[PDB]
Structure 1
């Protein structure tokens, strides 16, 4: 059989998610506690959320001038980027208060993740950035490619076992990227999740976005912008032939 490196997803559990939350960042902390960053001018926020209920336990509303983007948690601090700017915000997770700001050298601010030592960033280009959390200088730039094509639109990120997984904006795909060298290690296809919500009558929903990993219990959670549900998912390696050019069409929008 092929080393397909393409996965489909099974829903293990469904949980409520705020259908007014324009998800741009998603983090799993501990004890069924999530952190989330939302966008939209006048609606951007960082939130502590209970997994089981989707209840917002604590919220920090941003100034109306910002469009909140990616979010990650590193050593008790939540780091957040914002659309079109090089500024980012740091919140203490104990209080959800803004303790510090920073500036990074990306070309935009879309996604953040961490391996527990440094920050990874995306900005909608095909570059996955390594960012030093002390100096906020770039450590390295990985140019992510698939079959020679640039993988642009890298969006919400999550570090999982040596990989950085990235939503690709406006697709139902997640790229699995090597944190070591930027290699495209695999593609996850999730179109069944949005389709299921549309079929349940939730017609006003926006795109798949937001990935969070619970390392302790080995749970993967995903949601989407304005989605009324957040899903716990299990990956399954494909056991069928992927048509020529399928990933290029559906995940790279070529």
Structure 2
């Protein structure tokens, strides 16, 4: 009754196996990743093919960085427990503004009007990109059930794709109703990943290139980012 989708790997690119991926998006032929690298949080511009870093800033010691997303000429980023967000110039990564919000920050994406954030609960926040305060929320449900643990996000083709932390699934959420309209099953994808690092952590990170319709998924300490297409199951 809830349509399930299987992946096909189109390509697979090296990813930093030391990087706890907290936020991930695609822009300008580049990856942008919010990364934990030994308790320190950095934000990073990655070359897609090499997985190498082309540019980074570090967050201050007291912040744990989470979701990131572009917005026009900016990167917006969340913190885990600080209630503080940042706005950077996407070009030189110089901090430009801070803002406050309640609760935790996990994932962050955007559609044409709004920044969209998760925080591990079933409740997604739509933010005014200007005031940076919520104007709508939706509650996320799968077969009528509240779906908590919503993590990294990505707006894909009219929908919110969200990692569900500690599963290998991605949910497609109708932004209007908050209903899960679809489930992407990435179980076993790691078997396709080449030799695994020690340690390795969980699926998390979805980026999308609107122009070419390319979907990229990764995860914390993963050795690959995967470009994937979807096929609806049987």
Q: Do both proteins adopt the same fold according to a TM-score greater than 0.5, normalized to the shorter chain?
A: yes
Return the alpha-carbon distance in structure 2 between the equivalents of residues 115 and 168 of structure 1: 20
Unaligned runs of 5+ in 2: none
Corresponding residue number in structure 2 for 1:168: 164
Using a 3 Å threshold, how does the CA distance of structure 1 residues 28 and 61 change in structure 2: closer, same or farther?
same
The correspondence of residues 78-97 of structure 1 with structure 2, limited to 5 A, is 78-97=75-94
Corresponding residue number in structure 2 for 1:19: 17
Corresponding residue number in structure 2 for 1:243: none
Corresponding residue number in structure 2 for 1:138: 134
Q: Is the counterpart of residue 192 in structure 1 residue 176 in structure 2? A: no
Q: Is the counterpart of residue 202 in structure 1 residue 187 in structure 2? A: no
1:70, distance to aligned residue in structure 2 (A): 0.5
TM-score of the aligned structures, taking structure 1 as reference length:
0.88
Corresponding residue number in structure 2 for 1:114: 110
Check whether the contact 1:166–1:175 (CA below 8 A) recurs between aligned residues.
Answer: yes
RMSD, aligned α-carbons: 1.4
The correspondence of residues 213-232 of structure 1 with structure 2, limited to 5 A, is 213-232=208-227
Corresponding residue number in structure 2 for 1:28: 26
Moved more, 33-42 or 177-186: 33-42
Q: Secondary structure at the match of 1:191?
A: coil
Check whether the contact 2:8–2:230 (CA below 8 A) recurs between aligned residues.
Answer: yes
Unaligned runs of 5+ in 1: 240-254
Q: Secondary structure at the match of 2:188?
A: helix
Return the alpha-carbon distance in structure 2 between the equivalents of residues 85 and 130 of structure 1: 19
Using a 3 Å threshold, how does the CA distance of structure 1 residues 71 and 201 change in structure 2: closer, same or farther?
closer
Query: Per-residue CA shift, 1:114-133, capped at 9, x if unaligned?
Result: 01321100000000111111
- Runs (4+) off by over 2 Å: 39-43, 194-197, 199-203
Query: Per-residue CA shift, 1:132-151, capped at 9, x if unaligned?
Result: 11122211111101122211
Q: Secondary structure at the match of 1:27?
A: strand
Return the alpha-carbon distance in structure 2 between the equivalents of residues 85 and 116 of structure 1: 27
Query: Per-residue CA shift, 1:19-63, capped at 9, x if unaligned?
Result: 1111010010022x1111013664311001111111100000111
Check whether the contact 1:41–1:65 (CA below 8 A) recurs between aligned residues.
Answer: no
Corresponding residue number in structure 2 for 1:98: 95
Query: Per-residue CA shift, 1:198-221, capped at 9, x if unaligned?
Result: x73434110000000001111000
Corresponding residue number in structure 2 for 1:178: 174
TM-score of the aligned structures, taking structure 2 as reference length:
0.95
Q: Secondary structure at the match of 1:194?
A: helix
Query: Per-residue CA shift, 1:130-179, capped at 9, x if unaligned?
Result: 11111222111111011222110000000011101000101100010012
- Indicate which of 48, 56, 70 corresponds to 2:45: 48
